[PDB]
Amino acid sequence: VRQIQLLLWKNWTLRKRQKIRFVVELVWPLSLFLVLIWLRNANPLYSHHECHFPNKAMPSAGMLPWLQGIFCNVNNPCFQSPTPGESPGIVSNYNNSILARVYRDFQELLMNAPESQHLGRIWTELHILSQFMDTLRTHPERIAGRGIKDEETLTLFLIKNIGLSDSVVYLLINSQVRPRSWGGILSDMSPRIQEFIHRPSMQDLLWVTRPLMQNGGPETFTKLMGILSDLLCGYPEGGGSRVLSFNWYEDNNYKAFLGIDSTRKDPIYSYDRRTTSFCNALIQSLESNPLTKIAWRAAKPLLMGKILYTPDSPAARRILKNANSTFEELEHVRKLVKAWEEVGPQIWYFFDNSTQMNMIRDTLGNPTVKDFLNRQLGEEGITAEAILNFLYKGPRESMANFDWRDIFNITDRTLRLVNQYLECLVLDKFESYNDETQLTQRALSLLEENMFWAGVVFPDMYPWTSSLPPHVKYKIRMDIDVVEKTNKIKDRYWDSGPRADPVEDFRYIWGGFAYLQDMVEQGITRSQVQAEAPVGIYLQQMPYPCFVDDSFMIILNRCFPIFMVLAWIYSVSMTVKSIVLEKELRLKETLKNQGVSNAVIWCTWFLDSFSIMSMSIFLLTIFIMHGRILHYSDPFILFLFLLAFSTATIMLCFLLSTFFSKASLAAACSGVIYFTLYLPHILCFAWQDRMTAELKKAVSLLSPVAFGFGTEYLVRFEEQGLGLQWSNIGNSPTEGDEFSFLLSMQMMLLDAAVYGLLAWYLDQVFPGDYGTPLPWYFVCVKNLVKLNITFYENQITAFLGHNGAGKTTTLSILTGLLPPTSGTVLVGGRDIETSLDAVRQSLGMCPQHNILFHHLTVAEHMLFYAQLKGKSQEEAQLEMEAMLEDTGLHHKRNEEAQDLSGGMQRKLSVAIAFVGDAKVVILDEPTSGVDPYSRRSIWDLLLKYRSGRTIIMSTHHMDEADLLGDRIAIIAQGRLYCSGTPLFLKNCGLYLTLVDVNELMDVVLHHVPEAKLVECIGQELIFLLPNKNFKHRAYASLFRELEETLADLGLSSFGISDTPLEEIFLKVTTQLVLQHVQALLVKRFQHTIRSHKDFLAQIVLPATFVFLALMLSIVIPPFGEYPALTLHPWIYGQQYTFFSMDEPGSEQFTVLADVLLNKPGFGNRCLKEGWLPEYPCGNSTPWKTPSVSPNITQLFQKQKWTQVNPSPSCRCSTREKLTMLPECPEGAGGLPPPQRTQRSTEILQDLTDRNISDFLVKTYPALIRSSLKSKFWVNEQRYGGISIGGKLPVVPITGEALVGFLSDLGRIMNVSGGPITREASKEIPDFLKHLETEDNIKVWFNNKGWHALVSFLNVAHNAILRASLPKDRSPEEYGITVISQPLNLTKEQLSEITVLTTSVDAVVAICVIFSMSFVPASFVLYLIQERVNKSKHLQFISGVSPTTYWVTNFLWDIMNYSVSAGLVVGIFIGFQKKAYTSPENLPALVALLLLYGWAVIPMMYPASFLFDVPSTAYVALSCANLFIGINSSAITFILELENNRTLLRFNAVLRKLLIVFPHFCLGRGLIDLALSQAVTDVYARFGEEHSANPFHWDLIGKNLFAMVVEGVVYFLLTLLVQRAEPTKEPIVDEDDDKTDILRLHELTKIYPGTSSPAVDRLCVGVRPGECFGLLGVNGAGKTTTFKMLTGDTTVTSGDATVAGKSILTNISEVHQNMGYCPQFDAIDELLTGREHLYLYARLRGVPAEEIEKVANWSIKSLGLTVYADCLAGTYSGGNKRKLSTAIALIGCPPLVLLDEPTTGMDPQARRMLWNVIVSIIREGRAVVLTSHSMEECEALCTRLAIMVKGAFRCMGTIQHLKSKFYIVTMKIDLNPVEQFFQGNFPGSVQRERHYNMLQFQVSSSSLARIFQLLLSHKDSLLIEEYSVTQTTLDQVFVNFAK
Ligand SMILES: *[C@@H]1O[C@H](CO)[C@@H](O[C@@H]2O[C@H](CO)[C@@H](O[C@@H]3O[C@H](CO)[C@@H](O)[C@H](O)[C@@H]3O)[C@H](O)[C@H]2NC(C)=O)[C@H](O)[C@H]1NC(C)=O
Ligand SMILES: *[C@@H]1O[C@H](CO)[C@@H](O[C@@H]2O[C@H](CO)[C@@H](O)[C@H](O)[C@H]2NC(C)=O)[C@H](O)[C@H]1NC(C)=O
Ligand SMILES: *[C@@H]1O[C@H](CO)[C@@H](O)[C@H](O)[C@H]1NC(C)=O
Ligand SMILES: *[C@@H]1O[C@H](CO)[C@@H](O)[C@H](O)[C@H]1NC(C)=O
Ligand SMILES: *[C@@H]1O[C@H](CO)[C@@H](O)[C@H](O)[C@H]1NC(C)=O
């Protein structure tokens, strides 16, 4: 088919000529995705490496490990390499620290080396003899000549004075000449000590200790913390990495969009306590300084907090006595520190005054080897005297490290400071309360000062239950701020990451829940068993693989379809508007009649809507690739997906093309239907994806839903990279989901196909032009019988006929639109047998409506309409040139059809009506409405196309038929009357009009006996004379007589006229306002009850929106309710929990494993119904083994792999592409776990003798991928078993009896002494036993599960309890359960819940406002409908001033708004929506609802003036109101949430700026009501309560007052928006190129009501009986004068407006003067839907009262009881005009301005209307006519006037006016008549060829000479018949504006 090319070219021409929709459709979606590009740039993707978190020691695993662990893991570091904790045997990570390295260097060189054994003897020598001390050493010394003392054998002295030739003289005794033992070879462990101090352990002293030694505190606290970590922690890789857990999606609204988030109620200051009075100082310094205001707030409950137990029963006291294991040893530590107070005074006694200190001073000569000390300088740092060093520098003397100064003083100061700090602790934390209700109030009291840890309430035990049940159950009641919420157990939004923030998500560790829980369970276990065998807990979080968390992935999954829909919404609207407009102009019917099929039209529309769509999609894909938003998916499959979406939406537009007939309405409605069809994808995405049937084709019947599913799959793929590559486009992609991206696109294409097919099916049957439901396919033209018509080849055969009397059906049969067959209508020599071909190519037609496109130029209109049935384009140029030459419109070749003149449009349509060489042509009213000059132009065009064509024109103008062409054909409901020329059909007589009565009538009677005065009208006289056998006396002798006698008689005019064709055609066939507002109210009531698309659509749609809002708000559960969780591992779904059995050599560990995995099951599910009341436990115990995977799994791991990386790693490809999880290969973690077994529900894996980390971190991606199906609530099928076994590598070697060694050191001293040190040392072995635990167990927990670390503590402690008990009391009955029940919230805690609820309240308030705003939009639509379509100024002139009109419209608006308000309040009254139905709150709500309309309707009213389309105003107002309300509520709500100078602006806009808007007032009213209700509910169960009476006069009352004042001021504004006479003359001189003494007479001038001289200086007025016709050319449209005279509108004063309505000028009295001149409303102002009562409403404006007459007054009309009962919108073309002109004359007004009194009416009705007009002018009621048809202005206008170029030209009666500005027709050889017309008559004109029907016009008054030669001498000139007619008034009018 070739029509597709031309149709596509036409569509492209329209698209290019629009130039406004094309540019925006191409540019604006790019701008929309620029938002996505900006969001991608702003929101980055977080990428991070592998994590291996260290251990988290528990209080049951010693004090030292737990304390150093809580100090080390303050950040919970992420470590790439696995920590030593994950290893099977070793469990302590802190063996790389400086202290650990020092302790490893020691205990190796010194203790564990067989070198100190010898020195032990010297150490234990002591040799401290108490009796042989204290200056008691004297000996007799009787030895002589020898020593060991001094010889005493001499007569002079012994040793001193006898040192010369005598006895002993020196240390060695000698009588002749003067002169055990060695400890450790005089050196002991010298080289060992030197080596030990020369190790890297010097870094402990000379590198890191030196900053601490200098001053108290080296520098800022960060460096001190780092130094302490280096000493204690010693973590590798420096400071550990962090994940920062960037996920706020769990509440925390203040920190996301409210700016800075305020903390909790911070304490004021240290307001006294029982502490040291120094601890208060540091507490104040920490809780007031912002640096530590956060850390101390999270540390005060632990150091200074209380734990409360409810039962107070002896069992509870016994349990807690076994639970204070850590505190009873922290007290021991504190006592040990405090023992310094007594030790120090005795240690310092060794320097000031001590005998021991003197020994080293006295040992310098020979004791302790030689003079050198350290074995004669054994080491470089050794030796020196040491008597002037840190060893001693005298008891008191004045140096870098001399004496015990700089060591003892600093040590004492540090120890005293440590004792003071440690005294700032509370260890009697356990407080004994009862009944569990004092617990809650005391916790509430303590939480103000943060001195409250928790409360351990025990269910089901009375205060008198000394014994302990086999199943001991207990609860922990934490504060909700520092405990995980118990209402949600999962994150509810899976984000790739380990969820390991130090402070944001580990509320179970730093909050103290886990520590207290473990202490309580340890107490319970040790009370129920009491068999020692201590086993702690070393909770270790599961490793996490390297991940790339992209925060943008949340977007583009719920925002990409939003943007796509909002991007093609305007294209959808524009294309639907174009399609509907192509049918509204009745142009699709024209195309179908021309020959092109419907399928071709659909195909070309698809091509037009697809070319621009493809261009836009190409631009969008280029932008997306350039925007770096979809970087990995594909460059091309995205383009294919968008093309599929485009064709789907084009098919949907084709579907929505139906159900519509108006372009604007369809354009407005499609733009919202296309989004409503996209809503249920959002509905399924929001809390509905979990409930899926694996085949969403049923719900994806809408294309946007399919696009949403496809983009969801694209998002889910983009996380792993390669989103939509061809390799995995479909074939069960996305973790084996049945629904596929490829399948989704294919079914969307099928959806487009079915939409197109259904659109075809509907369009074949829905339009009213034609239909066929359920088709179930399986001499040129002449008519002998069809009745007898033979259209001649060169005649304009006017096919006249009455409406519905064969004038339409016969044409429809002949044109082939409805071929009846069985006839002899041989059109052009061809029959009906084949009318599709060779007929339409030469049967160009023209319907009544125009067939010109709005936007095509005339240079292309004829081109398209000639090539539609043409073949080539070269001939098309010649045809266009010929058509332009004929039409004479060559100058206006580039002007579009819309810009063409009104009269030129019809001329062009007739020109293109028959252009493809149409031999036979059909015309339907070629000149229905045109200017007479344009009528003559189009007639000249038609007469130039008669060379070979046989044009057939069916005109309702009988006057036009006689002048268009010969051979008229009138059909009188059957057959043919007479197919002859009008001259031969006129005589199927001659009426001469002569314009005193007695003198005028005397001439007619005297000179003729058959002369009769037909009508003696005013200023007229119509004389009737016979036509047949009239001789010469009655032919023109009267004209000779009238001309002979014309000076005496006035007349001044004369003429002869023939019989008009109109006759021939018919021959064949106050106290007034109260009664006006009532009428307007009745009209409104009738209109609103006779329209189901305006009343119900405005009282139900808001109700539906409010119901949807209520449904959305109700389903939201309360946010402030926190239930209690049983805290067992089965709270989640089916899961894998592993099982490592390490340290097999311990029988206790073997029995623990056996009673963990086999006998009582994994967990707590006892033999009785416990720990799982609703979870039954089955009996499977399969003990299976995984089958081999010989693909590569049984082979790749079958090679030799060392201890390192036993698995073949996996691809952490986060280098060039962000793949999030590594997506590890088939190797994964290696061989599968040896067994899978389940007892209750969970699969158990025996990870024994197998690497745990290499499996846990590597098989996790596979499990999560297999489990991730919705990404909302996904169970990763694993949370972490517990690894039985593991020894704490560091254990105190000394153990017990260390005090005995310490006592021996203090034995020879006062180092022993003091009451405090005895108390500290009496129970030291228990302290050392509890310092660390030898055998220990590890626990693995997945922190992504919220309640996992707690639950696995519970299962581990249950196992420990079941293992420690002896070989009796079977463990199947023994268990412990914890229940986390947080405390009830406080004011500040519930403030967040109040804000969260107020958010939903504001959302529902916005929905209610948007729903309620529709009614004012409907009122505006009605106002525009009755404004632009007239009937506005019609009611103005016929009614009271606009003030009362607007008042009654306001009253009706209130009446129609009250019902909707009642519906809304009645849908709120059900279910008690947010307690809006309360007796105190309901009046406020109903008042707000009622007053919102009163306040917003006056703002809706002015929108009528701005908007002219009565359909675009609805959307442009609803969207505007929605935007205003949303903006107002958002500004007034989100800004209300931190004193950052925005609160002043917020208050200003709340008080003065935004208070004006009623939408803001209603929003504030509902928001404040919701807040008040929430506060009342909060205070209800707190016992406070308050009144909070509505109408606060400052909170919600101000909104009501604002609405009340706004309604009045805006009504005044609407009234204001709706809100000269120099000289005049009575003289009339326009007749030749003095008062008012007549009825309905005017004596005034006139001036234009504009800035240009439109109508100035008009005539005076009209006589009582005078139908003054205000005619004129289209240049002077008379609108500027008609509007000024009546109807107001453009009735501005201008320069000199002085015209009056016969009683007063139209200055300051137009309203009073408007009661005399009812306009005829040439715009067909029947804008209502009232039947038989529309005239009842229009009959108002009665002088005093007509209520008893209005029934009969409506009866007087133009033949009532015909269409009166029919609906006003169901009237025919002329019926509405007849009704309008009947209304225009109801009160017999003196002056009537009948503008276009009839239009498109059959002559049978035009004659009746003219009869009514003459009847009403007979009495004296003047009328005014301005119709373009000269037939009406000649048969009705007694006087006539024509205005040209802005001024009138001529006046007077029609006959006298035509005389200043008589054609004889003869019917027969033109030889004798031509000679007679040139020999007898000197003047003549053309003879109109020799067609035997010639028309002769004489330019002279010698009518007498045309009688004898014409009638009497007819045979002399061979004339069969003759007739004389004067020139038509149309010639005179054309002559003026020629
Ligand atoms: C768990 O063990 C700790 C170990 O101390 C208990 O701590 C309590 O500590 C306070 C102060 O250190 C003791 O108060 C003292 O009472 C004596 C009189 O008995 C008085 O003379 C002192 O001046 C001081 O006020 C308190 O006695 C002590 N508790 C016990 C039971 O001895 C903690 O109470 C233990 N918890 C449980 C639940 O048993
Ligand atoms: C805090 O909330 C708890 C919820 O369990 C309240 O305890 C019960 O609250 C309900 C109301 O929903 C009452 O009907 C019960 O009587 C309460 N229990 C008891 C034993 O009285 C608790 O009262 C609340 N505390 C407050 C509001 O201070
Ligand atoms: C911890 O374990 C042993 C204990 O001596 C030793 O290899 C070293 O101190 C540490 N090993 C590490 C950190 O790999
Ligand atoms: C400790 O240091 C102080 C401060 O200089 C000093 O006065 C004192 O002598 C030193 N030695 C002591 C207190 O034994
Ligand atoms: C121990 O202290 C007491 C009193 O403080 C004192 O008398 C005694 O001498 C001291 N010990 C020695 C060895 O001096």
Author numbering: 4 to 151, 158 to 188, 271 to 489, 494 to 873, 929 to 936, 949 to 1150, 1154 to 1160, 1204 to 1277, ...
Question: Which text from the study accompanies this structure?
Answer:
ABCA4 is an ATP-binding cassette (ABC) transporter that flips N-retinylidene-phosphatidylethanolamine (N-Ret-PE) from the lumen to the cytoplasmic leaflet of photoreceptor membranes. Human ABCA4 is a 2273 amino acid full transporter organized in two nonidentical tandem halves with each half containing a transmembrane domain (TMD) consisting of six membrane-spanning segments, a nucleotide-binding domain (NBD), and a large glycosylated exocytoplasmic domain (ECD) between the first and second membrane-spanning segments. The importance of this transport activity is evident by the finding that over 1200 mutations in the gene encoding ABCA4 are known to cause Stargardt disease (STGD1), an autosomal recessive macular degenerative disease characterized by severe loss in central vision, degeneration of photoreceptors and underlying retinal pigment epithelial cells, and the accumulation of lipofuscin deposits containing di-retinoid compounds.
TMD1 and TMD2, each consisting of six transmembrane segments (TM), display an outward-facing conformation as found for ABCA1. This feature, also found in the ABCA1 structure, most likely represents a structural lipid important for stabilizing the protein. An elongated tunnel or cavity accessible to the intradiscal space and lined with hydrophobic residues is found extending through the central and lid regions. Eight asparagine residues post-translationally modified with N-linked glycosylation are evident with four in ECD1 (N98, N415, N444, N504) and four in ECD2 (N1469, N1529, N1588, N1662) in agreement with earlier biochemical techniques. As observed in Type V ABC transporters, the NBDs are closely positioned opposite each other in a head-to-tail configuration.
